[PDB]
Enzyme design. Sequence first.
Site, PDB file in Angstrom:
ATOM      1  N   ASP A   1       0.838  -1.190   0.000  1.00  0.00           N
ATOM      2  CA  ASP A   1       0.000   0.000   0.000  1.00  0.00           C
ATOM      3  C   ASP A   1       0.876   1.244   0.000  1.00  0.00           C
ATOM      4  O   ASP A   1       1.886   1.304   0.708  1.00  0.00           O
ATOM      5  CB  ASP A   1      -0.937   0.016   1.207  1.00  0.00           C
ATOM      6  CG  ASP A   1      -2.228   0.750   0.927  1.00  0.00           C
ATOM      7  OD1 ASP A   1      -2.316   1.420  -0.123  1.00  0.00           O
ATOM      8  OD2 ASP A   1      -3.155   0.660   1.757  1.00  0.00           O
TER       9      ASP A   1
ATOM     10  N   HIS B   1      -0.512   4.567   0.220  1.00  0.00           N
ATOM     11  CA  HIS B   1      -1.280   5.711   0.694  1.00  0.00           C
ATOM     12  C   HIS B   1      -0.932   6.001   2.148  1.00  0.00           C
ATOM     13  O   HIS B   1      -1.030   5.114   3.002  1.00  0.00           O
ATOM     14  CB  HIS B   1      -2.780   5.454   0.550  1.00  0.00           C
ATOM     15  CG  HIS B   1      -3.184   5.002  -0.819  1.00  0.00           C
ATOM     16  ND1 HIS B   1      -3.208   3.674  -1.187  1.00  0.00           N
ATOM     17  CD2 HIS B   1      -3.578   5.701  -1.909  1.00  0.00           C
ATOM     18  CE1 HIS B   1      -3.601   3.575  -2.444  1.00  0.00           C
ATOM     19  NE2 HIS B   1      -3.832   4.791  -2.905  1.00  0.00           N
TER      20      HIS B   1
ATOM     21  N   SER C   1      -4.518  -5.002   1.778  1.00  0.00           N
ATOM     22  CA  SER C   1      -3.829  -4.612   3.001  1.00  0.00           C
ATOM     23  C   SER C   1      -4.421  -5.276   4.236  1.00  0.00           C
ATOM     24  O   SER C   1      -3.732  -5.380   5.254  1.00  0.00           O
ATOM     25  CB  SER C   1      -3.865  -3.093   3.160  1.00  0.00           C
ATOM     26  OG  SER C   1      -3.199  -2.456   2.085  1.00  0.00           O
TER      27      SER C   1
HETATM   28  C1  B12 Z   1     -10.632   9.805  -2.852  1.00  0.00           C
HETATM   29  C2  B12 Z   1     -10.318   8.324  -2.602  1.00  0.00           C
HETATM   30  C3  B12 Z   1      -9.279   7.771  -3.311  1.00  0.00           C
HETATM   31  C4  B12 Z   1      -7.912   8.370  -3.244  1.00  0.00           C
HETATM   32  C5  B12 Z   1      -7.237   7.826  -1.931  1.00  0.00           C
HETATM   33  C6  B12 Z   1      -6.947   8.995  -0.965  1.00  0.00           C
HETATM   34  C7  B12 Z   1      -5.559   8.815  -0.313  1.00  0.00           C
HETATM   35  N1  B12 Z   1      -4.520   8.567  -1.032  1.00  0.00           N
HETATM   36  O1  B12 Z   1      -5.508   8.931   0.965  1.00  0.00           O
HETATM   37  C8  B12 Z   1      -7.310   7.794  -4.538  1.00  0.00           C
HETATM   38  C9  B12 Z   1      -7.591   8.776  -5.729  1.00  0.00           C
HETATM   39  C10 B12 Z   1      -5.793   7.469  -4.492  1.00  0.00           C
HETATM   40  C11 B12 Z   1      -8.198   6.587  -4.793  1.00  0.00           C
HETATM   41  C12 B12 Z   1      -7.789   5.501  -5.527  1.00  0.00           C
HETATM   42  C13 B12 Z   1      -8.219   4.208  -5.326  1.00  0.00           C
HETATM   43  N2  B12 Z   1      -9.053   3.788  -4.377  1.00  0.00           N
HETATM   44 CO1  B12 Z   1      -9.966   5.008  -3.227  1.00  0.00          CO
HETATM   45  N3  B12 Z   1     -11.202   6.070  -2.226  1.00  0.00           N
HETATM   46  C14 B12 Z   1     -11.213   7.355  -2.025  1.00  0.00           C
HETATM   47  C15 B12 Z   1     -12.010   7.596  -0.701  1.00  0.00           C
HETATM   48  C16 B12 Z   1     -13.272   8.195  -1.453  1.00  0.00           C
HETATM   49  C17 B12 Z   1     -11.591   8.593   0.347  1.00  0.00           C
HETATM   50  C18 B12 Z   1     -11.134   7.990   1.707  1.00  0.00           C
HETATM   51  C19 B12 Z   1      -9.778   8.640   2.022  1.00  0.00           C
HETATM   52  O2  B12 Z   1      -8.760   8.202   1.506  1.00  0.00           O
HETATM   53  N4  B12 Z   1      -9.786   9.654   2.861  1.00  0.00           N
HETATM   54  C20 B12 Z   1      -8.460  10.247   3.124  1.00  0.00           C
HETATM   55  C21 B12 Z   1      -7.924   9.899   4.517  1.00  0.00           C
HETATM   56  C22 B12 Z   1      -7.718  11.154   5.380  1.00  0.00           C
HETATM   57  O3  B12 Z   1      -8.915   9.074   5.197  1.00  0.00           O
HETATM   58  P1  B12 Z   1      -8.467   7.674   5.873  1.00  0.00           P
HETATM   59  O4  B12 Z   1      -7.415   7.075   4.943  1.00  0.00           O
HETATM   60  O5  B12 Z   1      -9.647   6.890   6.260  1.00  0.00           O
HETATM   61  O6  B12 Z   1      -7.621   8.157   7.194  1.00  0.00           O
HETATM   62  C23 B12 Z   1      -8.283   8.386   8.406  1.00  0.00           C
HETATM   63  C24 B12 Z   1      -8.694   7.201   9.259  1.00  0.00           C
HETATM   64  O7  B12 Z   1      -8.866   5.998   8.565  1.00  0.00           O
HETATM   65  C25 B12 Z   1      -7.595   7.114  10.356  1.00  0.00           C
HETATM   66  N5  B12 Z   1      -6.393   6.334  10.051  1.00  0.00           N
HETATM   67  C26 B12 Z   1      -5.836   6.092   8.866  1.00  0.00           C
HETATM   68  N6  B12 Z   1      -4.754   5.350   8.958  1.00  0.00           N
HETATM   69  C27 B12 Z   1      -4.577   5.074  10.313  1.00  0.00           C
HETATM   70  C28 B12 Z   1      -3.615   4.339  11.028  1.00  0.00           C
HETATM   71  C29 B12 Z   1      -3.771   4.284  12.418  1.00  0.00           C
HETATM   72  C30 B12 Z   1      -2.798   3.524  13.290  1.00  0.00           C
HETATM   73  C31 B12 Z   1      -4.854   4.934  13.132  1.00  0.00           C
HETATM   74  C32 B12 Z   1      -4.951   4.832  14.604  1.00  0.00           C
HETATM   75  C33 B12 Z   1      -5.800   5.662  12.384  1.00  0.00           C
HETATM   76  C34 B12 Z   1      -5.607   5.692  11.002  1.00  0.00           C
HETATM   77  O8  B12 Z   1      -7.164   8.428  10.518  1.00  0.00           O
HETATM   78  C35 B12 Z   1      -7.249   9.173   9.284  1.00  0.00           C
HETATM   79  C36 B12 Z   1      -7.642  10.611   9.571  1.00  0.00           C
HETATM   80  O9  B12 Z   1      -9.104  10.658   9.653  1.00  0.00           O
HETATM   81  C37 B12 Z   1     -12.446   6.212  -0.201  1.00  0.00           C
HETATM   82  C38 B12 Z   1     -13.919   6.084   0.286  1.00  0.00           C
HETATM   83  C39 B12 Z   1     -14.035   5.937   1.804  1.00  0.00           C
HETATM   84  N7  B12 Z   1     -15.198   6.322   2.319  1.00  0.00           N
HETATM   85  O10 B12 Z   1     -13.112   5.487   2.495  1.00  0.00           O
HETATM   86  C40 B12 Z   1     -12.178   5.341  -1.406  1.00  0.00           C
HETATM   87  C41 B12 Z   1     -11.544   3.937  -1.123  1.00  0.00           C
HETATM   88  C42 B12 Z   1     -10.550   4.071   0.060  1.00  0.00           C
HETATM   89  N8  B12 Z   1     -10.854   3.622  -2.390  1.00  0.00           N
HETATM   90  C43 B12 Z   1     -10.728   2.330  -2.523  1.00  0.00           C
HETATM   91  C44 B12 Z   1     -10.218   1.738  -3.745  1.00  0.00           C
HETATM   92  C45 B12 Z   1     -11.152   0.627  -4.309  1.00  0.00           C
HETATM   93  C46 B12 Z   1      -9.351   2.437  -4.567  1.00  0.00           C
HETATM   94  C47 B12 Z   1      -8.583   1.917  -5.798  1.00  0.00           C
HETATM   95  C48 B12 Z   1      -7.947   0.531  -5.649  1.00  0.00           C
HETATM   96  C49 B12 Z   1      -9.506   2.047  -7.064  1.00  0.00           C
HETATM   97  C50 B12 Z   1      -8.673   2.148  -8.378  1.00  0.00           C
HETATM   98  N9  B12 Z   1      -8.566   3.329  -8.949  1.00  0.00           N
HETATM   99  O11 B12 Z   1      -8.160   1.080  -8.816  1.00  0.00           O
HETATM  100  C51 B12 Z   1      -7.514   3.047  -5.981  1.00  0.00           C
HETATM  101  C52 B12 Z   1      -6.230   2.745  -5.133  1.00  0.00           C
HETATM  102  C53 B12 Z   1      -4.962   2.587  -5.988  1.00  0.00           C
HETATM  103  C54 B12 Z   1      -4.233   3.868  -6.179  1.00  0.00           C
HETATM  104  N10 B12 Z   1      -4.827   4.975  -6.647  1.00  0.00           N
HETATM  105  O12 B12 Z   1      -3.009   3.927  -5.894  1.00  0.00           O
HETATM  106  C55 B12 Z   1     -11.641   1.582  -1.564  1.00  0.00           C
HETATM  107  C56 B12 Z   1     -10.905   0.657  -0.505  1.00  0.00           C
HETATM  108  C57 B12 Z   1     -10.283  -0.623  -1.153  1.00  0.00           C
HETATM  109  C58 B12 Z   1     -11.260  -1.693  -1.644  1.00  0.00           C
HETATM  110  N11 B12 Z   1     -12.582  -1.504  -1.695  1.00  0.00           N
HETATM  111  O13 B12 Z   1     -10.793  -2.775  -2.008  1.00  0.00           O
HETATM  112  C59 B12 Z   1     -12.541   2.705  -0.990  1.00  0.00           C
HETATM  113  C60 B12 Z   1     -12.991   2.460   0.480  1.00  0.00           C
HETATM  114  C61 B12 Z   1     -13.736   2.866  -1.965  1.00  0.00           C
HETATM  115  C62 B12 Z   1     -14.617   1.613  -1.970  1.00  0.00           C
HETATM  116  N12 B12 Z   1     -15.842   1.752  -1.455  1.00  0.00           N
HETATM  117  O14 B12 Z   1     -14.334   0.492  -2.397  1.00  0.00           O
HETATM  118  N13 B12 Z   1      -9.232   6.538  -3.914  1.00  0.00           N
END
Ligand code: B12
Length: 596
Positions: free
Chosen positions: A114, A116, A167
């Site tokens: 991963d 990200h 992951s």
């Molecule tokens: C815009 C977005 C993208 C962004 C990712 C943003 C990034 N790089 O951080 C990009 C454009 C890269 C994208 C691409 C893809 N994505 Co995307 N994306 C989204 C989305 C809509 C936003 C979530 C997000 O990343 N927020 C940004 C950060 C701030 O949020 P977060 O990571 O959750 O972090 C928070 C918490 O989780 C926590 N946290 C995070 N890490 C840790 C670690 C610890 C220890 C702790 C305590 C807390 C913690 O704290 C953070 C602050 O709030 C989600 C939808 C969703 N509701 O999750 C789908 C999602 C994450 N995407 C996903 C997928 C499918 C993909 C792709 C594989 C699709 C593709 N194009 O082939 C690619 C990934 C490959 C690549 N591009 O390299 C899936 C997950 C994987 C799956 N379903 O198998 C989701 C959930 C969509 C779905 N419903 O399927 N995507």
Amino acid sequence: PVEERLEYALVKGIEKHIIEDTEEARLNQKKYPRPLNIIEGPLMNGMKIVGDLFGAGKMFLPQVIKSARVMKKAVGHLIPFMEKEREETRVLNGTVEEEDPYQGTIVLATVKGDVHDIGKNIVGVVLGCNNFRVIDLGVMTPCDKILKAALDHKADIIGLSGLITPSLDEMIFVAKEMERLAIRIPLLIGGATTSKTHTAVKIAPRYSAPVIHVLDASKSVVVCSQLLDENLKDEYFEEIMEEYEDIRQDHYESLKERRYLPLSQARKSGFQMDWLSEPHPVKPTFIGTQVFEDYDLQKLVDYIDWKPFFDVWQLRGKYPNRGFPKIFNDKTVGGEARKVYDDAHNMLNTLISQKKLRARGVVGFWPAQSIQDDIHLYAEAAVPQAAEPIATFYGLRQQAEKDSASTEPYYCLSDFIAPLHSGIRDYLGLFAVACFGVEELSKAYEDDGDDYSSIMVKALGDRLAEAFAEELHERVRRELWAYCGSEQLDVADLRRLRYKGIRPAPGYPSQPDHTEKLTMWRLADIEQSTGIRLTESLAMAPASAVSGLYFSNLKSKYFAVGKISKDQVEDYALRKNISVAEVEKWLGPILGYDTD
Ligand code: B12
């Protein structure tokens, strides 16, 4: 007094005179016999004020990053004197004392495969604002390296981050490996692909020490403080244990309570089209790939959807101001959102005008026909009914039983491609775009010490990749495929999915199998044409990359496959000519049956 100035600079986020005030307080050896007092006292007091204000929701995330930057400059000014003091005492007394002011050491890493780390970086900064010594390990971290980092740094907590479903397997592997060395360190779980149910069911039982899922960065501080406080450690662990046992029991009861149709019965009730009366598919302007080497970033500025960008900064506007541009009108987060938006625009203009970011992409079209649940791609001059397919994209059909009042069919991606025996020519497209140069800019900003600018540039790179994907889909509909030549919708309608056709991506609920990217990369030669490479867990590097397939059918729509039965897994394995274990590994989140 200088302590009040230090606290005001820390809370407000003023680096302008922080060096001068820190030096003035250091020269005041009367109050601080050792420079550790300036750390343990006035400086961590302001950091604690900032952390508790953020936890209460009064102060927002960008101000927290500003305070972190001020504190980083202060400690950067102080650390030469810390090194001098330690070097002096190593010779004067022959020993190094326990001079740690932090509450604890936390190893923070993104699991292997991963790339990200925006959320991980935000979590690390937030924890560091609460006097935690965050040890950020980066992306694609091997499990052995995480364990070695914990062992060498005498870590107190380990945090795992992951964005894609492959992951989750890595996280479970890390948990069981931690159990295998009999490590008792608590393990936190986070990431967009993680869930509370998956942790307790899959990750928690493999590790005897506490395993807690954390939804966001704000809850991370509470969890870490409860885990590092001996007056609350055992009780919190017991409460976690009871709630996880309850959720596991509920999960097993539910799993017993779900019903699924037989695969043949689901196919018999699948989505149908009247190809004998529907308009014929429109042939694309070319068969093959058209490569973009340096796309115009200025064209991608007006295609950016800013709502996920404001979700990155946790600036969530209340109704009815929940989205851009109405978020700027909100009473609470309006000013912070405006400041962050202005900074983002400034950085975007600077990076675009300086050619510091490059966008590359490729789009291809091939003739495609449907055979049950699969889409077969053929050569340009080959007749589909009398030629071997050059590629195949295998679809998954919805198998979960629906409500008796519901009449929706059981969808598959192959339902939107004309069947081979229908005698109708059909075509399918695919694309892959990326924004190059985010990694180097983020590294340069982090080396300087501006975590705020690093988070901003990562978010802007993701926004640029999404804008490139949207713009390329717009071009395909109107120019390269020309099946929607009369389309004139604005970007607002584009974000509302009001146009013809869909662009499903591998790993999404429409087709949650991440191995579908290998066929695209082999067919369109994406890695050589555009430089976007697939990792070991089939993630796209750089992280600011978007790919997918182009379906031009009018009736095509996004759907969630959901849980599937064993028989569909066996049929998928037979079709893909792979083992059942591989299918269960790549479709684990969508399995409707237990495997152990
Ligand atoms: C815009 C977005 C993208 C962004 C990712 C943003 C990034 N790089 O951080 C990009 C454009 C890269 C994208 C691409 C893809 N994505 Co995307 N994306 C989204 C989305 C809509 C936003 C979530 C997000 O990343 N927020 C940004 C950060 C701030 O949020 P977060 O990571 O959750 O972090 C928070 C918490 O989780 C926590 N946290 C995070 N890490 C840790 C670690 C610890 C220890 C702790 C305590 C807390 C913690 O704290 C953070 C602050 O709030 C989600 C939808 C969703 N509701 O999750 C789908 C999602 C994450 N995407 C996903 C997928 C499918 C993909 C792709 C594989 C699709 C593709 N194009 O082939 C690619 C990934 C490959 C690549 N591009 O390299 C899936 C997950 C994987 C799956 N379903 O198998 C989701 C959930 C969509 C779905 N419903 O399927 N995507």
